[PDB]
Amino acid sequence: ASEAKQTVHTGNTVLLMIKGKPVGRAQSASGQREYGTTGVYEIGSIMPQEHVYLRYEGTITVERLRMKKE
Amino acid sequence: MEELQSRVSEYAMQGGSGNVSGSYLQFFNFTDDSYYKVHLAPQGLKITRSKDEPLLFRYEITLVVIGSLTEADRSAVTTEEFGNVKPN
């Protein structure tokens, strides 16, 4: 219930800091990180025997209401 | 597939005297009505198994046609031979 005891993160308990300053009047921030993980298959056996990692495809989107300036 | 490979290997290897004195292969293309006498082409029996479809074999065959199977061998045809070919 209270901030000092809740177990979960919420929109009201987080601040988004860019270059040392807090972002004002954002609406959502969402981040996708995909490793391009792929399994290694084989003749004679139908199932893959390990996964391996290709490219660190890492992204964050910021959506914000336009401050009158700044 | 292994039986096929072993038949083709045995047919190919025994032909080391220029040409087998017996038959060529016989190819019963039953699906559309047609019949041929055929010999292994110089492409041969190419066998492969890629990553895609791991548990399925694939085979590639190429063949050259000697003649229709309706017709008997050229040299074996019984000529007229009337009179006497072996005069005394």
Side-chain angles (χ1 to χ4, degrees):
Chain A
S2 293
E3 291 288 321
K5 285 176 185 176
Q6 67 191 338
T7 54
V8 194
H9 281 296
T10 67
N12 74 271
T13 193
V14 174
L15 281 165
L16 178 60
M17 280 181 63
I18 181 168
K19 210 172 184 178
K21 286 77 171 286
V23 180
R25 309 194 181 195
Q27 289 290 49
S28 66
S30 295
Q32 282 199 354
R33 298 175 216 93
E34 320 206 60
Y35 322 114
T37 311
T38 297
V40 175
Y41 304 85
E42 286 186 346
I43 59 177
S45 171
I46 188 155
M47 45 167 60
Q49 298 303 303
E50 68 197 61
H51 308 100
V52 301
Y53 313 100
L54 304 188
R55 311 188 308 216
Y56 206 98
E57 181 168 10
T59 292
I60 179 166
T61 298
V62 181
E63 291 194 20
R64 188 192 174 176
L65 310 178
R66 178 167 183 98
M67 288 275 279
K68 188 176 178 179
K69 288 171 282 185
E70 68 164 33
Chain B
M1 198 279 287
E2 286 172 29
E3 179 62 20
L4 180 61
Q5 283 188 102
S6 183
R7 289 296 149 192
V8 172
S9 186
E10 179 164 69
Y11 182 77
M13 285 174 61
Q14 65 78 52
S17 59
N19 186 28
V20 67
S21 180
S23 303
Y24 327 97
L25 302 190
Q26 291 161 23
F27 187 89
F28 283 95
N29 171 43
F30 286 128
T31 307
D32 38 330
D33 307 68
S34 180
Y35 310 93
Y36 300 104
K37 293 180 310 174
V38 306
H39 196 65
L40 298 179
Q43 285 69 24
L45 178 77
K46 170 172 190 287
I47 299 315
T48 168
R49 193 169 75 270
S50 184
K51 187 172 178 185
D52 298 309
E53 312 176 358
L55 307 181
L56 282 183
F57 313 91
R58 177 165 289 93
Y59 55 93
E60 299 184 21
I61 291 163
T62 311
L63 298 165
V64 301
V65 184
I66 291 162
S68 186
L69 173 57
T70 67
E71 307 312 308
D73 286 332
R74 196 74 69 173
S75 49
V77 71
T78 290
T79 196
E80 294 174 53
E81 204 177 339
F82 284 8
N84 181 14
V85 72
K86 189 81 170 189
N88 188 249

Short mmCIF file of all heavy atoms in Angstrom, two decimals, chain A:
data_model
loop_
_atom_site.label_atom_id
_atom_site.label_comp_id
_atom_site.label_asym_id
_atom_site.label_seq_id
_atom_site.Cartn_x
_atom_site.Cartn_y
_atom_site.Cartn_z
N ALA A 1 0.84 -1.23 0.00
CA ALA A 1 0.00 0.00 0.00
C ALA A 1 0.86 1.26 0.00
O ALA A 1 0.75 2.09 -0.90
CB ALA A 1 -0.93 0.00 1.20
N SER A 2 1.71 1.40 1.01
CA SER A 2 2.57 2.57 1.11
C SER A 2 3.80 2.42 0.22
O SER A 2 4.20 1.32 -0.18
CB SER A 2 3.01 2.82 2.55
OG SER A 2 1.91 3.20 3.36
N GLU A 3 4.39 3.57 -0.11
CA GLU A 3 5.61 3.58 -0.91
C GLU A 3 6.75 2.86 -0.18
O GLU A 3 7.54 2.14 -0.81
CB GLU A 3 6.01 5.03 -1.21
CG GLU A 3 5.06 5.73 -2.17
CD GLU A 3 5.18 5.21 -3.59
OE1 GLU A 3 6.32 4.95 -4.03
OE2 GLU A 3 4.14 5.06 -4.27
N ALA A 4 6.84 3.05 1.14
CA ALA A 4 7.92 2.49 1.94
C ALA A 4 7.80 0.99 2.17
O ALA A 4 8.69 0.41 2.81
CB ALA A 4 8.02 3.19 3.30
N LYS A 5 6.74 0.35 1.66
CA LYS A 5 6.54 -1.08 1.89
C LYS A 5 6.07 -1.86 0.67
O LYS A 5 6.04 -3.09 0.74
CB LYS A 5 5.52 -1.29 3.02
CG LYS A 5 6.11 -1.02 4.40
CD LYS A 5 5.06 -1.13 5.50
CE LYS A 5 5.64 -0.74 6.85
NZ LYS A 5 4.61 -0.74 7.93
N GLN A 6 5.70 -1.22 -0.43
CA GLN A 6 5.19 -1.96 -1.58
C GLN A 6 6.30 -2.76 -2.25
O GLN A 6 7.48 -2.39 -2.23
CB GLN A 6 4.54 -1.01 -2.58
CG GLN A 6 5.49 -0.05 -3.29
CD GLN A 6 4.74 1.02 -4.07
OE1 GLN A 6 3.58 0.84 -4.42
NE2 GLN A 6 5.41 2.13 -4.34
N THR A 7 5.90 -3.87 -2.87
CA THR A 7 6.80 -4.84 -3.48
C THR A 7 6.99 -4.65 -4.98
O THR A 7 7.83 -5.33 -5.56
CB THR A 7 6.27 -6.26 -3.24
OG1 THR A 7 4.92 -6.36 -3.70
CG2 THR A 7 6.34 -6.64 -1.76
N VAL A 8 6.24 -3.74 -5.61
CA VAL A 8 6.16 -3.63 -7.06
C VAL A 8 6.52 -2.21 -7.47
O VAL A 8 6.24 -1.25 -6.75
CB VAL A 8 4.75 -4.00 -7.57
CG1 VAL A 8 4.76 -4.23 -9.08
CG2 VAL A 8 4.19 -5.22 -6.84
N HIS A 9 7.14 -2.09 -8.64
CA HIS A 9 7.42 -0.79 -9.22
C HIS A 9 6.21 -0.30 -10.02
O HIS A 9 5.49 -1.08 -10.64
CB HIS A 9 8.66 -0.83 -10.12
CG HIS A 9 9.95 -0.79 -9.35
ND1 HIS A 9 10.33 0.30 -8.59
CD2 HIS A 9 10.96 -1.68 -9.25
CE1 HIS A 9 11.47 0.03 -7.99
NE2 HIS A 9 11.89 -1.15 -8.40
N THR A 10 6.02 1.02 -10.00
CA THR A 10 4.86 1.68 -10.57
C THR A 10 5.34 2.91 -11.33
O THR A 10 6.50 3.32 -11.22
CB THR A 10 3.85 2.12 -9.49
OG1 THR A 10 4.43 3.15 -8.69
CG2 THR A 10 3.46 0.95 -8.60
N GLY A 11 4.42 3.50 -12.10
CA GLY A 11 4.76 4.73 -12.79
C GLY A 11 5.05 5.89 -11.86
O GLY A 11 5.82 6.79 -12.21
N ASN A 12 4.47 5.89 -10.66
CA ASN A 12 4.66 7.02 -9.76
C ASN A 12 5.95 6.93 -8.94
O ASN A 12 6.41 7.97 -8.46
CB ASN A 12 3.43 7.18 -8.83
CG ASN A 12 3.36 6.13 -7.73
OD1 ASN A 12 2.78 5.06 -7.92
ND2 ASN A 12 3.99 6.41 -6.60
N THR A 13 6.54 5.75 -8.74
CA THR A 13 7.78 5.62 -7.98
C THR A 13 9.08 5.67 -8.81
O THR A 13 10.15 5.44 -8.24
CB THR A 13 7.78 4.32 -7.17
OG1 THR A 13 8.84 4.36 -6.21
CG2 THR A 13 7.98 3.10 -8.06
N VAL A 14 9.03 5.97 -10.11
CA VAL A 14 10.20 5.93 -10.98
C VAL A 14 10.43 7.31 -11.59
O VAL A 14 9.46 8.02 -11.89
CB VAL A 14 10.05 4.85 -12.08
CG1 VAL A 14 11.22 4.88 -13.10
CG2 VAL A 14 9.96 3.46 -11.46
N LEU A 15 11.70 7.67 -11.78
CA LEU A 15 12.10 8.87 -12.51
C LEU A 15 13.03 8.47 -13.65
O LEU A 15 13.87 7.58 -13.49
CB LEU A 15 12.81 9.90 -11.62
CG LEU A 15 11.90 10.77 -10.73
CD1 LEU A 15 12.69 11.49 -9.65
CD2 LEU A 15 11.11 11.78 -11.57
N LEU A 16 12.87 9.14 -14.79
CA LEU A 16 13.66 8.90 -15.99
C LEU A 16 14.65 10.05 -16.13
O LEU A 16 14.24 11.19 -16.38
CB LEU A 16 12.75 8.78 -17.21
CG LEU A 16 13.40 8.57 -18.58
CD1 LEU A 16 14.21 7.28 -18.61
CD2 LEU A 16 12.34 8.55 -19.66
N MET A 17 15.95 9.75 -15.98
CA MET A 17 16.99 10.77 -15.98
C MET A 17 17.81 10.69 -17.27
O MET A 17 18.37 9.63 -17.59
CB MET A 17 17.90 10.69 -14.75
CG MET A 17 17.27 11.33 -13.52
SD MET A 17 18.28 11.29 -12.03
CE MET A 17 19.70 12.28 -12.51
N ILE A 18 17.89 11.81 -17.97
CA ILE A 18 18.64 11.96 -19.21
C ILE A 18 19.66 13.08 -19.01
O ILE A 18 19.29 14.19 -18.62
CB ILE A 18 17.71 12.26 -20.41
CG1 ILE A 18 18.52 12.40 -21.71
CG2 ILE A 18 16.86 13.52 -20.16
CD1 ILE A 18 17.65 12.41 -22.96
N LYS A 19 20.93 12.76 -19.27
CA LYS A 19 22.05 13.69 -19.15
C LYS A 19 22.03 14.46 -17.83
O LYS A 19 22.32 15.66 -17.77
CB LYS A 19 22.09 14.67 -20.33
CG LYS A 19 23.53 15.10 -20.64
CD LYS A 19 23.59 15.91 -21.93
CE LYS A 19 25.03 16.26 -22.28
NZ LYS A 19 25.18 17.01 -23.56
N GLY A 20 21.67 13.77 -16.75
CA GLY A 20 21.73 14.31 -15.41
C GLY A 20 20.49 15.03 -14.93
O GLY A 20 20.46 15.47 -13.77
N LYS A 21 19.46 15.17 -15.78
CA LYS A 21 18.23 15.89 -15.46
C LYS A 21 17.03 14.94 -15.53
O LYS A 21 17.05 13.99 -16.31
CB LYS A 21 17.96 17.05 -16.44
CG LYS A 21 18.84 18.30 -16.28
CD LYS A 21 20.23 18.09 -16.86
CE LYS A 21 21.05 19.39 -16.93
NZ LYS A 21 20.59 20.30 -18.02
N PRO A 22 15.98 15.18 -14.74
CA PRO A 22 14.77 14.35 -14.86
C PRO A 22 13.94 14.75 -16.08
O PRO A 22 13.76 15.93 -16.37
CB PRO A 22 14.01 14.66 -13.56
CG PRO A 22 14.41 16.07 -13.26
CD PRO A 22 15.84 16.19 -13.68
N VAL A 23 13.42 13.75 -16.80
CA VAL A 23 12.51 14.02 -17.91
C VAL A 23 11.17 14.46 -17.35
O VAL A 23 10.64 13.84 -16.41
CB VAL A 23 12.35 12.79 -18.83
CG1 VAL A 23 11.40 13.09 -19.99
CG2 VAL A 23 13.69 12.45 -19.47
N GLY A 24 10.61 15.52 -17.91
CA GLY A 24 9.33 16.05 -17.47
C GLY A 24 8.21 15.58 -18.38
O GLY A 24 8.33 15.65 -19.60
N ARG A 25 7.15 15.07 -17.78
CA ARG A 25 5.86 14.87 -18.46
C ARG A 25 5.96 13.88 -19.62
O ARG A 25 5.34 14.06 -20.69
CB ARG A 25 5.32 16.20 -18.96
CG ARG A 25 5.24 17.33 -17.96
CD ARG A 25 4.43 18.55 -18.28
NE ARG A 25 4.56 19.45 -17.14
CZ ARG A 25 3.80 20.51 -16.89
NH1 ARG A 25 2.77 20.83 -17.66
NH2 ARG A 25 4.21 21.39 -15.98
N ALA A 26 6.79 12.85 -19.43
CA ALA A 26 6.72 11.62 -20.20
C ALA A 26 5.39 10.91 -19.97
O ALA A 26 4.68 11.16 -18.99
CB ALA A 26 7.88 10.70 -19.82
N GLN A 27 5.06 10.01 -20.90
CA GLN A 27 3.89 9.15 -20.80
C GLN A 27 4.24 7.67 -20.73
O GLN A 27 3.65 6.95 -19.92
CB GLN A 27 2.94 9.39 -21.99
CG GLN A 27 2.18 10.73 -21.97
CD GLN A 27 1.11 10.84 -20.87
OE1 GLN A 27 1.36 10.54 -19.70
NE2 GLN A 27 -0.08 11.28 -21.26
N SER A 28 5.17 7.19 -21.54
CA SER A 28 5.68 5.83 -21.37
C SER A 28 7.08 5.71 -21.94
O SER A 28 7.41 6.32 -22.96
CB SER A 28 4.77 4.79 -22.02
OG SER A 28 4.77 4.92 -23.43
N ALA A 29 7.86 4.82 -21.32
CA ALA A 29 9.16 4.40 -21.83
C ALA A 29 9.18 2.88 -21.90
O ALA A 29 8.91 2.21 -20.90
CB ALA A 29 10.30 4.89 -20.94
N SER A 30 9.58 2.34 -23.06
CA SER A 30 9.56 0.89 -23.26
C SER A 30 10.83 0.49 -23.97
O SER A 30 11.27 1.16 -24.91
CB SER A 30 8.34 0.40 -24.06
OG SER A 30 7.13 0.63 -23.36
N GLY A 31 11.43 -0.61 -23.51
CA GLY A 31 12.71 -1.07 -24.02
C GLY A 31 12.67 -2.52 -24.44
O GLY A 31 12.28 -3.39 -23.66
N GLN A 32 13.07 -2.79 -25.68
CA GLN A 32 13.22 -4.14 -26.20
C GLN A 32 14.70 -4.44 -26.41
O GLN A 32 15.42 -3.65 -27.04
CB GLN A 32 12.46 -4.34 -27.51
CG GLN A 32 10.96 -4.53 -27.31
CD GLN A 32 10.29 -5.17 -28.51
OE1 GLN A 32 10.92 -5.38 -29.55
NE2 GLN A 32 9.01 -5.50 -28.38
N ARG A 33 15.14 -5.57 -25.87
CA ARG A 33 16.49 -6.08 -26.06
C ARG A 33 16.34 -7.51 -26.54
O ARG A 33 15.78 -8.34 -25.82
CB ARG A 33 17.29 -6.02 -24.76
CG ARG A 33 17.46 -4.59 -24.27
CD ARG A 33 18.14 -4.46 -22.92
NE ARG A 33 17.56 -3.34 -22.18
CZ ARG A 33 16.56 -3.42 -21.30
NH1 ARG A 33 16.01 -4.58 -20.97
NH2 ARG A 33 16.10 -2.30 -20.75
N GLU A 34 16.81 -7.79 -27.76
CA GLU A 34 16.72 -9.12 -28.34
C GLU A 34 18.12 -9.54 -28.77
O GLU A 34 18.84 -8.77 -29.42
CB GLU A 34 15.76 -9.16 -29.54
CG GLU A 34 14.49 -8.34 -29.36
CD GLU A 34 13.34 -8.87 -30.19
OE1 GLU A 34 12.95 -10.04 -30.00
OE2 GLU A 34 12.83 -8.12 -31.05
N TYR A 35 18.48 -10.76 -28.41
CA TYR A 35 19.81 -11.30 -28.68
C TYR A 35 19.88 -12.02 -30.01
O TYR A 35 20.95 -12.53 -30.37
CB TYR A 35 20.22 -12.24 -27.55
CG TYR A 35 19.74 -11.69 -26.24
CD1 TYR A 35 18.76 -12.34 -25.51
CD2 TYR A 35 20.22 -10.49 -25.78
CE1 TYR A 35 18.30 -11.80 -24.32
CE2 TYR A 35 19.75 -9.94 -24.64
CZ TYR A 35 18.82 -10.60 -23.89
OH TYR A 35 18.41 -10.03 -22.71
N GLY A 36 18.78 -12.06 -30.76
CA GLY A 36 18.74 -12.86 -31.96
C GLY A 36 19.00 -14.33 -31.72
O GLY A 36 19.58 -14.99 -32.58
N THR A 37 18.67 -14.82 -30.52
CA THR A 37 18.95 -16.19 -30.13
C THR A 37 18.36 -17.19 -31.12
O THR A 37 17.20 -17.08 -31.51
CB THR A 37 18.39 -16.45 -28.73
OG1 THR A 37 18.81 -15.39 -27.86
CG2 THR A 37 18.90 -17.77 -28.16
N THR A 38 19.18 -18.16 -31.51
CA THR A 38 18.84 -19.12 -32.55
C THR A 38 19.41 -20.49 -32.18
O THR A 38 20.52 -20.56 -31.65
CB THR A 38 19.39 -18.66 -33.90
OG1 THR A 38 18.77 -17.42 -34.27
CG2 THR A 38 19.12 -19.68 -34.98
N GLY A 39 18.66 -21.56 -32.46
CA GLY A 39 19.14 -22.90 -32.18
C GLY A 39 19.90 -23.51 -33.35
O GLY A 39 19.63 -23.21 -34.51
N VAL A 40 20.86 -24.37 -33.01
CA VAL A 40 21.74 -25.00 -33.99
C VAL A 40 21.19 -26.39 -34.27
O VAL A 40 21.21 -27.26 -33.39
CB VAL A 40 23.19 -25.05 -33.48
CG1 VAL A 40 24.10 -25.82 -34.43
CG2 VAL A 40 23.74 -23.64 -33.26
N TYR A 41 20.69 -26.63 -35.50
CA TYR A 41 20.13 -27.93 -35.86
C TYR A 41 21.18 -28.78 -36.57
O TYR A 41 22.33 -28.38 -36.76
CB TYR A 41 18.86 -27.84 -36.71
CG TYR A 41 17.73 -27.06 -36.13
CD1 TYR A 41 17.66 -25.68 -36.28
CD2 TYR A 41 16.69 -27.71 -35.48
CE1 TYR A 41 16.60 -24.97 -35.77
CE2 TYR A 41 15.66 -27.00 -34.92
CZ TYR A 41 15.59 -25.63 -35.10
OH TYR A 41 14.53 -24.94 -34.58
N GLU A 42 20.76 -29.97 -36.99
CA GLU A 42 21.65 -31.08 -37.27
C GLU A 42 20.95 -32.08 -38.18
O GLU A 42 19.76 -32.36 -37.99
CB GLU A 42 22.03 -31.76 -35.95
CG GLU A 42 23.02 -30.99 -35.09
CD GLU A 42 23.47 -31.77 -33.88
OE1 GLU A 42 22.82 -32.79 -33.56
OE2 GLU A 42 24.48 -31.38 -33.25
N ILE A 43 21.69 -32.65 -39.14
CA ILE A 43 21.14 -33.76 -39.91
C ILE A 43 20.98 -34.97 -38.99
O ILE A 43 21.77 -35.19 -38.07
CB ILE A 43 21.99 -34.12 -41.14
CG1 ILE A 43 23.44 -34.50 -40.76
CG2 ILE A 43 22.01 -32.98 -42.15
CD1 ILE A 43 24.29 -34.94 -41.94
N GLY A 44 19.93 -35.75 -39.24
CA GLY A 44 19.67 -36.97 -38.51
C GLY A 44 18.89 -36.81 -37.22
O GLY A 44 18.26 -37.78 -36.78
N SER A 45 18.96 -35.64 -36.58
CA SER A 45 18.19 -35.36 -35.37
C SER A 45 17.38 -34.10 -35.60
O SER A 45 17.91 -33.08 -36.05
CB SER A 45 19.08 -35.21 -34.14
OG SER A 45 18.36 -34.73 -33.02
N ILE A 46 16.09 -34.17 -35.28
CA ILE A 46 15.17 -33.10 -35.64
C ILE A 46 15.27 -31.90 -34.72
O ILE A 46 14.89 -30.79 -35.13
CB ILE A 46 13.72 -33.63 -35.64
CG1 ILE A 46 12.76 -32.58 -36.20
CG2 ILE A 46 13.26 -34.05 -34.23
CD1 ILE A 46 11.56 -33.19 -36.75
N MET A 47 15.83 -32.07 -33.48
CA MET A 47 15.77 -30.98 -32.50
C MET A 47 17.13 -30.30 -32.35
O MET A 47 18.17 -30.94 -32.54
CB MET A 47 15.31 -31.50 -31.13
CG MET A 47 15.96 -32.79 -30.65
SD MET A 47 15.64 -33.12 -28.90
CE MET A 47 13.85 -33.21 -28.90
N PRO A 48 17.16 -29.02 -32.00
CA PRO A 48 18.45 -28.32 -31.89
C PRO A 48 19.16 -28.69 -30.60
O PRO A 48 18.53 -28.98 -29.58
CB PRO A 48 18.03 -26.84 -31.91
CG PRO A 48 16.71 -26.84 -31.22
CD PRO A 48 16.05 -28.14 -31.59
N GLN A 49 20.49 -28.65 -30.65
CA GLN A 49 21.32 -29.17 -29.57
C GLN A 49 21.95 -28.08 -28.69
O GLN A 49 22.47 -28.40 -27.62
CB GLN A 49 22.41 -30.09 -30.15
CG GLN A 49 21.84 -31.33 -30.87
CD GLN A 49 20.96 -32.16 -29.98
OE1 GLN A 49 21.39 -32.61 -28.92
NE2 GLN A 49 19.66 -32.19 -30.30
N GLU A 50 21.91 -26.82 -29.12
CA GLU A 50 22.15 -25.68 -28.25
C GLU A 50 21.55 -24.45 -28.92
O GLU A 50 21.16 -24.50 -30.09
CB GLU A 50 23.66 -25.49 -28.01
CG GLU A 50 24.43 -25.07 -29.27
CD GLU A 50 25.92 -25.27 -29.17
OE1 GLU A 50 26.36 -26.43 -28.99
OE2 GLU A 50 26.67 -24.28 -29.27
N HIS A 51 21.46 -23.36 -28.17
CA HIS A 51 21.23 -22.04 -28.76
C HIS A 51 22.55 -21.28 -28.79
O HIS A 51 23.50 -21.60 -28.08
CB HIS A 51 20.16 -21.31 -27.95
CG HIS A 51 18.92 -22.13 -27.76
ND1 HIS A 51 18.65 -22.81 -26.59
CD2 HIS A 51 17.91 -22.43 -28.61
CE1 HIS A 51 17.51 -23.46 -26.71
NE2 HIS A 51 17.04 -23.25 -27.93
N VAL A 52 22.59 -20.27 -29.66
CA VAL A 52 23.71 -19.33 -29.73
C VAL A 52 23.10 -17.95 -29.92
O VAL A 52 21.93 -17.82 -30.30
CB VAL A 52 24.70 -19.69 -30.88
CG1 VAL A 52 25.25 -21.11 -30.68
CG2 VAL A 52 24.04 -19.57 -32.28
N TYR A 53 23.90 -16.92 -29.68
CA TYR A 53 23.44 -15.54 -29.71
C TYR A 53 24.10 -14.77 -30.85
O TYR A 53 25.32 -14.87 -31.04
CB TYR A 53 23.74 -14.90 -28.35
CG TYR A 53 23.31 -15.81 -27.23
CD1 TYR A 53 24.23 -16.61 -26.57
CD2 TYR A 53 21.97 -15.89 -26.87
CE1 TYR A 53 23.83 -17.46 -25.55
CE2 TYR A 53 21.56 -16.72 -25.84
CZ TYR A 53 22.49 -17.51 -25.19
OH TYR A 53 22.10 -18.34 -24.17
N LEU A 54 23.29 -14.03 -31.61
CA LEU A 54 23.76 -13.35 -32.81
C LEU A 54 24.10 -11.87 -32.59
O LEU A 54 25.28 -11.54 -32.46
CB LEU A 54 22.73 -13.54 -33.93
CG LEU A 54 22.38 -15.01 -34.25
CD1 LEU A 54 21.50 -15.14 -35.49
CD2 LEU A 54 23.62 -15.91 -34.39
N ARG A 55 23.10 -10.98 -32.53
CA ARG A 55 23.34 -9.54 -32.51
C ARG A 55 22.56 -8.90 -31.37
O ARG A 55 21.38 -9.20 -31.18
CB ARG A 55 22.94 -8.90 -33.85
CG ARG A 55 23.51 -9.62 -35.07
CD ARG A 55 23.28 -8.89 -36.39
NE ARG A 55 21.87 -8.54 -36.58
CZ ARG A 55 21.21 -8.54 -37.74
NH1 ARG A 55 21.72 -9.09 -38.84
NH2 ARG A 55 20.01 -7.99 -37.79
N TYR A 56 23.21 -8.01 -30.61
CA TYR A 56 22.54 -7.33 -29.50
C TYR A 56 21.66 -6.22 -30.07
O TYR A 56 22.04 -5.05 -30.14
CB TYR A 56 23.53 -6.79 -28.48
CG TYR A 56 22.85 -6.70 -27.13
CD1 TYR A 56 23.02 -7.69 -26.19
CD2 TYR A 56 22.00 -5.64 -26.82
CE1 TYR A 56 22.37 -7.64 -24.97
CE2 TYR A 56 21.32 -5.59 -25.63
CZ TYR A 56 21.52 -6.58 -24.70
OH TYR A 56 20.88 -6.52 -23.49
N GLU A 57 20.44 -6.59 -30.43
CA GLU A 57 19.46 -5.64 -30.95
C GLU A 57 18.75 -4.97 -29.78
O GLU A 57 17.73 -5.46 -29.29
CB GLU A 57 18.52 -6.37 -31.90
CG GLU A 57 17.46 -5.51 -32.54
CD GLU A 57 16.76 -6.23 -33.67
OE1 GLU A 57 16.97 -7.45 -33.83
OE2 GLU A 57 16.01 -5.57 -34.42
N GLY A 58 19.27 -3.81 -29.36
CA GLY A 58 18.82 -3.11 -28.16
C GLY A 58 18.22 -1.74 -28.42
O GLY A 58 18.86 -0.89 -29.05
N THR A 59 17.01 -1.49 -27.90
CA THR A 59 16.25 -0.29 -28.22
C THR A 59 15.45 0.19 -27.01
O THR A 59 15.07 -0.60 -26.15
CB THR A 59 15.33 -0.57 -29.44
OG1 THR A 59 16.15 -0.76 -30.59
CG2 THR A 59 14.39 0.60 -29.73
N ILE A 60 15.25 1.51 -26.92
CA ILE A 60 14.30 2.12 -25.98
C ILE A 60 13.54 3.21 -26.71
O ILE A 60 14.12 4.02 -27.44
CB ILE A 60 14.97 2.69 -24.70
CG1 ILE A 60 13.92 3.33 -23.78
CG2 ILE A 60 16.05 3.72 -25.03
CD1 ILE A 60 14.39 3.61 -22.36
N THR A 61 12.22 3.24 -26.50
CA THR A 61 11.34 4.29 -27.01
C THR A 61 10.90 5.17 -25.85
O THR A 61 10.65 4.67 -24.75
CB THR A 61 10.11 3.69 -27.71
OG1 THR A 61 10.53 2.91 -28.84
CG2 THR A 61 9.15 4.79 -28.18
N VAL A 62 10.84 6.47 -26.09
CA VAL A 62 10.35 7.46 -25.13
C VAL A 62 9.19 8.21 -25.77
O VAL A 62 9.35 8.77 -26.87
CB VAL A 62 11.47 8.42 -24.69
CG1 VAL A 62 10.95 9.44 -23.66
CG2 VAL A 62 12.64 7.64 -24.09
N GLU A 63 8.04 8.24 -25.10
CA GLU A 63 6.88 9.00 -25.54
C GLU A 63 6.58 10.07 -24.50
O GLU A 63 6.56 9.78 -23.30
CB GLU A 63 5.67 8.09 -25.77
CG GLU A 63 5.85 7.16 -26.97
CD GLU A 63 4.56 6.50 -27.44
OE1 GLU A 63 3.46 7.00 -27.12
OE2 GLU A 63 4.65 5.47 -28.14
N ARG A 64 6.36 11.30 -24.96
CA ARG A 64 6.33 12.45 -24.06
C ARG A 64 5.36 13.51 -24.59
O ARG A 64 5.16 13.64 -25.80
CB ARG A 64 7.75 13.00 -23.87
CG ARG A 64 7.89 14.07 -22.82
CD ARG A 64 9.25 14.76 -22.89
NE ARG A 64 9.44 15.90 -22.00
CZ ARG A 64 10.59 16.54 -21.89
NH1 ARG A 64 11.60 16.33 -22.72
NH2 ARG A 64 10.76 17.41 -20.89
N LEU A 65 4.75 14.24 -23.65
CA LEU A 65 3.92 15.38 -23.98
C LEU A 65 4.81 16.61 -24.12
O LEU A 65 5.73 16.81 -23.33
CB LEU A 65 2.86 15.60 -22.90
CG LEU A 65 2.03 14.38 -22.49
CD1 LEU A 65 1.07 14.77 -21.38
CD2 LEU A 65 1.29 13.75 -23.67
N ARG A 66 4.53 17.43 -25.13
CA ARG A 66 5.49 18.47 -25.50
C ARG A 66 5.48 19.57 -24.44
O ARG A 66 4.48 20.27 -24.27
CB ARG A 66 5.18 19.04 -26.88
CG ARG A 66 6.15 20.17 -27.28
CD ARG A 66 6.07 20.54 -28.75
NE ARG A 66 7.06 21.57 -29.08
CZ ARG A 66 8.25 21.36 -29.64
NH1 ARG A 66 8.67 20.14 -29.96
NH2 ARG A 66 9.04 22.40 -29.90
N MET A 67 6.60 19.72 -23.75
CA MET A 67 6.78 20.86 -22.87
C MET A 67 6.76 22.14 -23.71
O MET A 67 7.19 22.13 -24.87
CB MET A 67 8.08 20.72 -22.09
CG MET A 67 8.03 19.66 -21.00
SD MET A 67 7.34 20.27 -19.45
CE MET A 67 8.80 21.07 -18.78
N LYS A 68 6.23 23.22 -23.13
CA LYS A 68 6.04 24.45 -23.90
C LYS A 68 7.35 24.94 -24.49
O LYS A 68 7.38 25.43 -25.63
CB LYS A 68 5.40 25.53 -23.03
CG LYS A 68 4.98 26.80 -23.77
CD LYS A 68 4.27 27.77 -22.83
CE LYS A 68 3.88 29.06 -23.52
NZ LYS A 68 3.17 29.97 -22.58
N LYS A 69 8.44 24.82 -23.74
CA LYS A 69 9.79 24.94 -24.27
C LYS A 69 10.61 23.81 -23.65
O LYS A 69 10.06 22.89 -23.03
CB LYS A 69 10.33 26.35 -24.01
CG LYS A 69 9.66 27.43 -24.89
CD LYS A 69 10.03 28.85 -24.48
CE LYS A 69 9.27 29.31 -23.25
NZ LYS A 69 9.55 30.74 -22.92
N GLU A 70 11.93 23.85 -23.86
CA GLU A 70 12.89 22.85 -23.37
C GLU A 70 12.46 21.41 -23.70
O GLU A 70 12.67 20.49 -22.91
CB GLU A 70 13.15 22.99 -21.86
CG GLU A 70 12.00 22.65 -20.90
CD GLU A 70 12.47 22.46 -19.47
OE1 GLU A 70 13.44 23.13 -19.07
OE2 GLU A 70 11.87 21.62 -18.76
#
